[PDB]
Amino acid sequence: TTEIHPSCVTRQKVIGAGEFGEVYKGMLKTSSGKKEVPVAIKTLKAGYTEKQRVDFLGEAGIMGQFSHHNIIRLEGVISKYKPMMIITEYMENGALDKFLREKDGEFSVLQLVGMLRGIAAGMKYLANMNYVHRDLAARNILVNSNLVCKVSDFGLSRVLKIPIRWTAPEAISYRKFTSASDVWSFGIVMWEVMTYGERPYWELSNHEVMKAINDGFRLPTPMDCPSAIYQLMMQCWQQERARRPKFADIVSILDKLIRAPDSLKTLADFDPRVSIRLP
Numbered sequence: 001t002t003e004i005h006p007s008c009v010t011r012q013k014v015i016g017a018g019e020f021g022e023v024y025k026g027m028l029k030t031s032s033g034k035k036e037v038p039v040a041i042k043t044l045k046a047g048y049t050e051k052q053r054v055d056f057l058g059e060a061g062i063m064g065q066f067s068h069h070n071i072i073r074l075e076g077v078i079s080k081y082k083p084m085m086i087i088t089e090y091m092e093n094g095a096l097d098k099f100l101r102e103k104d105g106e107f108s109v110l111q112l113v114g115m116l117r118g119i120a121a122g123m124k125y126l127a128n129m130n131y132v133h134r135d136l137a138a139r140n141i142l143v144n145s146n147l148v149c150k151v152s153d154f155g156l157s158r159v160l161k162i163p164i165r166w167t168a169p170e171a172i173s174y175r176k177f178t179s180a181s182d183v184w185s186f187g188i189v190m191w192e193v194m195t196y197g198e199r200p201y202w203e204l205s206n207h208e209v210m211k212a213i214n215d216g217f218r219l220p221t222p223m224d225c226p227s228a229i230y231q232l233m234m235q236c237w238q239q240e241r242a243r244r245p246k247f248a249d250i251v252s253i254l255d256k257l258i259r260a261p262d263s264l265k266t267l268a269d270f271d272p273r274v275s276i277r278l279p
């Protein structure tokens, strides 16, 4: 990571809150003053514990190892001065789940699939770098003004509480977190994207979600969802982890679909939950 001097960072506005309250949008002066880039700034408030510092700076240490279009860029950190700060590229549309919920129905199928391809490319890179994310969910994807989606929030990532309904069965039960359990999570992210940010499994409790999954039941198809896309998410949810696609398979399949876009016009049947009978 690069150590940034506080004189090079301005905080302009509050853009969201998180674990280490809070997150600002600001500007970062770079290249000895010739360049100026918009940034997000996460701060660690005074009184933090040793664990909190290890987790806070560890996230930046992980992010700083990566250089990929679909992974949030770390500009640098302020650790020599307080409060400590992690400074990342600014993503104008924030978290993907909240963004889609505010854009319900407004994107095309091709656009949604392109977002998933970007996420998959970032995850393929991450897994190939020998990391497991463990917390892959649309809330942890960020979106810029150009609709590019980037993996973020590496607080739980590791080199080789987590929300149950994004987590593969073997990671829930045995704490066996691998790229294959991340593939399960990616399948849930596919469902989140295609539904414009619906809550996986709706009103089911965590125990009810585990009951359904272990009985072989899976999330139903989203409305207006290409058959190939639903088939792919179903494969990500294979009980046996060795049967799930690898991230390289996911990227390749999504690429083939995007480049032959009539392939996305064959839709999976949306199951009529509600019978409305008219003439």
Ligand SMILES: Nc1ncnc2c1ncn2[C@@H]1O[C@H](COP(=O)(O)OP(=O)(O)OP(O)(O)=S)[C@@H](O)[C@H]1O
Binding pocket: 015, 016, 017, 018, 019, 020, 023, 040, 042, 072, 088, 089, 090, 091, 092, 094, 095, 139, 142, 152, 153, 155
């Ligand atoms: N680079 C960014 N660009 C724009 N907004 C960001 C950026 N980073 C974080 N945020 C905002 O800050 C929110 C908090 O997410 P993060 O701080 O990345 O995760 P976190 O610190 O683990 O907090 P939680 O508890 O997961 S929301 C994000 O959901 C966005 O609302």
